[PDB]
Design a protein around this ligand. Structure first.
Ligand code: FMN
Ligand code: FMN
Ligand code: XCJ
Ligand code: XCJ
Ligand code: NA
Ligand code: NA
Ligand code: NA
Ligand code: NA
Lengths: 311, 310
């Protein structure tokens, strides 16, 4: 009674999930978040089965606490990643960038808890009917491939539509966003951009530093002309990509410009060729900090702001 | 008055009914003020004489504080500022620009000025030039929007200024009030929810389109002109989008959208109107007296956040 539902179901100390973040989120980050009492997440991204297997194996060496894997449903290896989840006995997965409906029964029967990101009420309701453990309502202010609705309106609508716990994502960097999210009906938060600037995140230092330097309007959106808006920091790449879209460049021309761009950011920190994906939250990130300090300060500040909060 | 905005504005509840061009007339503004919030008469694009009539009629309907919104893109903005000072309006909000050039005239007149700000820089500039408070309006609001969402804009503006911050964009009930106060706001400004108040004088069809709006119905037109507008999906707003996808020019769009908001508010023309509204429209489910809207909001916020400083 009076216990946080996400903490109880996932067996974690704090209802803070570090979001799966393609290329960004590796065993160093996931294990640090789980060791700090939240839920670390290894991102499958577009990587093949054998690469994510190594991350899972390495993560289990670094933490005894629960962690998850994010299945990014647009991946060409999505079927292999789902196999890997079940083979490796991963306790929990999140999903993004699509509808995981066709895997829910295999995952549910295998005991895996499934937490899909949902950008609409209809998908939230469908996920609850197919047996989702929880859903993540990610607002458009988040980094990466975004939906249309903001966190402020999406979280309460999803909470009104389903009875399973709702996890707020998009724009949360500190205890203020946690308290706001819980007031809107969430039982936990998922945090991406802030954890790029954790010490244990393995991205190139230039990526962390560009997030630190980000100003209020620096997290721009490319790909609106098409069907998949992507939020990323202003730099030479993203500005020229946006101009190419606006000047009617072909789907092929755009493909070559953007191919490998996120990896150029995370591996090489290449400030001219990288796509430094980040939410509008990037403007509020001010320090590189160990995950333990981030999470403990997050929950303490949420309590101070909203003493009634059910953490 | 413990709450800072309640003290400064001498109102019972820190709930402001946002100025809403063509929508917010004396009937709505007086009802909100009578209910203990701050009603606002929208100057919009209208001339001095039309807005003067609204101020006079509002005074006949309430003796509670109310304000006027100066919409800074109006062709008559100079006349409206003149009117504000001439009629000794106690408080104004501003939108759609930077009211820097009026701040000395307004502060010598004693006018409390509360500008809408979409950036940290404009927030800090308004504080430096004497703003009483600022409104941080997130992109989820209706009408001519900024880019940043409420979730990230409110805490950044609160971190940037010492004057009170008013959250706007997406607030329809006490959850949004509690969330806004958690982010650092001292009050909320609410637009779309009050379209579905009994006292709002828009055509019934406008209220219905808000009532029946789905989660994704409040779409953005005019990205290609640099003046984005959030409005409900309908024949007019689809065609505006289909025109942009066909490479329409700004002049073609501007002629297409002429008088569209008036078609919505006066005639309720479901095909020809621009029914501007926030993503909040999806959450609006009842047409309700303003007093009940505001009392229910405040009571719910206190229930969620017992220590809230309302
Ligand atoms: C660089 C980056 C990569 C991401 N990759 C994924 C992904 O592969 N799968 C997914 O579901 N979400 C992905 N996300 C979304 C995050 O998991 C998270 O929901 C989002 O970052 C939260 O918003 P915030 O950045 O404002 O904290 C990514 C976000 C970023 C910034
Ligand atoms: C139809 C409509 C007209 C508006 N007109 C104005 C205006 O003239 N001046 C202004 O500053 N804001 C204007 N706004 C913004 C509102 O004052 C308010 O900040 C916004 O509606 C809050 O977001 P919400 O609709 O989600 O509650 C308008 C909003 C709407 C929906
Ligand atoms: C592997 S990568 O480098 O190409 C890459 C980079 C960034 C990125 N960011 C993503 N963000 C999500 O997946 C979360 C989300 C928002 S809306 C939505 N959704 C839509 C239908 C169903 C869910 N999911 S995926 C993704 C993939
Ligand atoms: C008179 S009308 O029918 O043509 C019309 C219709 C809708 C409408 N909605 C508006 N919304 C705002 O003014 C609030 C806002 C958001 S961002 C911003 N801002 C940018 C720089 C400085 C402030 N102001 S004005 C406006 C005018
Ligand atoms: Na995303
Ligand atoms: Na920053
Ligand atoms: Na607006
Ligand atoms: Na509705």
């Amino acid at each position: 009674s009076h216990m946080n539902k996400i903490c109880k179901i996932l067996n974690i100390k704090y209802p803070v999930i570090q979001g799966g973040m393609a290329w960004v989120a590796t065993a160093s980050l996931a294990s640090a978040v789980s060791n700090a009492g939240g839920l670390g997440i290894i991102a499958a991204g577009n990587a093949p089965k054998e690469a994510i297997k190594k991350e899972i194996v390495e993560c289990k060496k670094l933490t005894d606490k629960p962690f998850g894997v994010n299945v990014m449903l647009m991946s060409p290896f999505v079927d292999d990643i789902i196999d890997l989840i079940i083979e490796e006995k991963v306790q929990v997965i999140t999903t993004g960038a699509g509808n995981p409906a066709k895997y829910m029964d295999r995952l549910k029967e295998a005991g895996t808890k499934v937490i899909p990101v949902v950008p609409t009420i209809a998908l939230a309701q469908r996920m609850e009917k197919l047996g989702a453990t929880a859903v993540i309502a990610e607002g458009t202010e988040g980094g990466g491939h975004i939906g249309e609705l903001t966190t402020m309106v999406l979280v309460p609508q999803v909470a009104d539509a389903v009875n399973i716990p709702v996890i707020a994502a998009g724009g949360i960097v500190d205890g203020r966003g946690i308290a706001a999210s819980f007031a809107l009906g969430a039982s936990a938060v998922q945090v991406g951009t802030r954890f790029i600037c954790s010490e244990e995140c393995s991205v190139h230092s230039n990526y962390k530093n560009l997030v630190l330097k980000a100003k209020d309007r620096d997290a721009i959106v490319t790909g609106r002309s098409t069907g998949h808006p992507v939020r990323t920091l202003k730099n030479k790449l993203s500005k020229e990509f946006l101009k190419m879209e606006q000047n009617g460049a072909t789907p092929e021309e755009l493909d070559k410009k953007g191919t490998g761009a996120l990896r150029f950011a995370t591996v090489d920190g290449d400030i001219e060729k990288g796509s430094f994906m980040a939410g509008q939250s990037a403007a509020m990130v001010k320090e590189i900090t160990p995950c333990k300090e981030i999470i403990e300060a997050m929950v303490n500040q949420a309590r101070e702001i909203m003493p009634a909060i059910e953490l």
